[PDB]
Amino acid sequence: GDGEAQRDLVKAVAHILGIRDLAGINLDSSLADLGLDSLMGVEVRQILEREHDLVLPIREVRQLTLRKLQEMSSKAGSDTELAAPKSKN
């Protein structure tokens, strides 16, 4: 029901592509460039919507540059209000 543990989305999404280490796989490539059309967006949504209620749709998910998946993995990211849009002036 609730996740006590959470992994990097690289060990999920990249693992769909058969990657994780990216030894010779480019990291500037958009997720759609990688192969996102079907599962590589559904899997993501089904994870994030339940993990952190973070539903980022395909138009945004398509630019998740593989390691960006672990950046928005939602673990230790939202300490207080995710990134907190707060700027003085």
CATH number of the domain bearing residue 20: 1.10.1200.10
User: 37 in a domain, yes or no?
Assistant: yes
Domain that holds residue 33: 1-72
Which residues are CB-contacts of 62 (< 8 A; sequence separation ≥ 6)?
30, 31, 32, 36, 41
Residue pair 64/73 in contact by the 8 Å Cβ criterion: no
How many distinct structural domains can be found in the chain?
1
This structure was determined by NMR
User: 86 in a domain, yes or no?
Assistant: no
- Residue of 29, 5, 9, 22 whose CA lies nearest to 71: 9
User: 42 in a domain, yes or no?
Assistant: yes
User: 53 in a domain, yes or no?
Assistant: yes
